[PDB]
Nucleic acid binder design. Structure first.
Ligand SMILES: [Zn+2]
Ligand SMILES: [Zn+2]
Ligand SMILES: [Zn+2]
Ligand SMILES: [Zn+2]
Lengths: 198, 198, 198, 198
DNA sequence: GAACCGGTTC
DNA sequence: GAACCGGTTC
DNA sequence: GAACCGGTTC
DNA sequence: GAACCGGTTC
């Protein structure tokens, strides 16, 4: 509970998370690599994800997004927004999301922003909502409010964003995860990591 | 309910929406592309649509027109009229439609203009009326009160206009949708998008 | 007093207005062509001018900037900021100067933005200051708050910016003028008009 | 008094500012190019300057350093430390000098950091001291507390550091100036700009 | 110090 | 989108 | 900065 | 309807 675990766990109610097709254009505001499981996004731009289920009934259950550093040494640094932005003008005046928080949800007002008093981890939870009438989809709109590259926060040390499905008491029914990179050029970053790997 | 769903849904009372033939002339005030499902219209000019039914009886039921941005990032921006028009002279003095609204209905005085107090979405609903004695047709006259290209509103980010058929309690019995583009030259825009695609 | 005169007028003090050399790079934030006597600048960016005089004072003199339309038919529309600029966030909240004004002054706190209660012309007046010791001219930082290209205000009808040096009682002691253009690309625009006269 | 003059001004005492030879090694903590009159230094490292005068006093004279932006459009933003520097641990706790200030003085306890309550310009003043016996110049140790490269404060718009020698009542007796650049690599940066003029 | 990256401008 | 810049890696 | 689009004039 | 213009995209 004190240290987040970072392993894929479908659990008994299969938990699956996918992405509608993202542009293969260099100008896309966000894009996901199925080869690497890496999300490339831009600051403050909605990158939506779809969580999908086939056996959706538990009660009052929610989904958490919790950012974590992959590399061992900072893993004990609470991930947060690096000092100029948490405190800049451009995205501080608008929401009730804590200025200190890295991850926001944009289309949901039943969002609960958690800053753990004991562990200090900050994450964002939404109540589970079945899809809108008739199909796999259920969209959550995330907003990333800083770069991976930023001074004071991640400082160019890549982070995995872990999404967990949880019962009201916190017990995990499903969880999946992938690493996220928040640069000013996700289409170019997508192509490059992939180039070096092949 | 907070985020509009944008998928075609005929529903149990088949819901179908069509267009009488529009000019293939470059001077047409409006025109629809069956290939792309894209409506090209001009500011403030009546572009009528026909909704048709074969099994028309529910009670007090209505049809909604609700504009939505297609692209993910603004989808959380309430679609509205960009600051010079909501506030210009030319179409503000005339109707009780809210100056802030993008979509109006012209031949109907039982129009109810909804500005959601909770979600903030603005849409226009009319009570369902059977056709005038004897044929498929039932016309609704829409007026688009700003360009897609306009500064402050859509700002050149294309929007889909979703028409839903709803019972008095709001439950959807039919819905269909298509993307709309509101330029100063719909005949030319029709020909061009279509050129690039083929 | 009701319709402004639009002619250059050297004073007893030989009022002259000049501009420092501006980068001729297209990336310049503003550039004047001495040839056509017209200023090209960018929205909201500081655009300083040079006044030079042969003698000083007399006590209490001021300098006014008042924009006026060159075409005969618009001259009776008071020239003001367009409704989209007038009502936005970017520069209305941070300023104490009235929002309807096209012309602002930067770094000067005794600026008086005159909105004639009677004629309605808007201008900005500062008290005359002799130059800083040993310099030839006192710089004034203007800010132009709408583009020539703008909808609702100036609307693509070119403007002359009239600069008058006047005693407290209003009599004109010096006068000069130039036509002003406020686009989003001043190096290119300057270059294109210059290409066009020949 | 409201907008600073940005011109070199020898006083009655022939105020001159020079710099000792700096290692030309790229490992130098700071290096000035006499050719371009611009200083290259490193964050938080002592960067001393030489003043020379032809005559002393008169009683009670002081020396001010005030940074000001070279580009016209930023000149009205008060130049200060960027929020990341302003609020950190490395140099805020150990110093009694105000954190918002770009310029600090080392080893001098009667330094007065002036934050104009009225104009808001920040500068640092020390009383003039004649040189130590038999030396030509009195050294002042400045510390620059944000990089030119910094986010939120200076943000990659070059700065002139204005050094003025002034009587207690504020009148300027001498003046000199240079453009300042505070990067993480001064020998290389100096060398690159110098390569570039020719 | 030379080589690298990743945000910024043209 | 390409070329440039400037702190960081090693 | 060059190339693109989409509203405006001739 | 064709040619021009001028902020925006990339
Ligand atoms: Zn940041
Ligand atoms: Zn509009
Ligand atoms: Zn305007
Ligand atoms: Zn800083």
């Amino acid at each position: 509970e004190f240290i987040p675990s970072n392993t894929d766990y479908p659990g008994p109610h299969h938990f699956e998370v996918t992405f509608q097709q993202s542009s293969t254009a260099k100008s896309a505001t966000w894009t996901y690599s199925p080869l690497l499981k890496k999300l490339y996004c831009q600051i403050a731009k909605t990158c939506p994800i779809q969580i999908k289920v086939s056996t959706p009934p538990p009660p009052g259950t929610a989904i958490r997004a919790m950012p974590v550093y992959k590399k061992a040494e900072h893993v004990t640094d609470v991930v947060k927004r690096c000092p100029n932005h948490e405190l800049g003008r451009d995205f501080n005046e608008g929401q009730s999301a804590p200025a200190s928080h890295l991850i926001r949800v944009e289309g949901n007002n039943l969002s609960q922003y958690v800053d753990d008093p004991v562990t200090g981890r900050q994450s964002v939870v939404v109540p589970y909502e079945p899809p809108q009438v008739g199909t796999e989809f259920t969209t959550i709109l995330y907003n990333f409010m800083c770069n991976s590259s930023c001074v004071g926060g991640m400082n160019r040390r890549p982070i995995l964003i872990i999404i967990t499905l949880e019962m009201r008491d916190g017990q995990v029914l499903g969880r999946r995860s992938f690493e996220g990179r928040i640069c000013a050029c996700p289409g170019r970053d997508r192509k490059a990591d992939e180039d070096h790997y092949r």
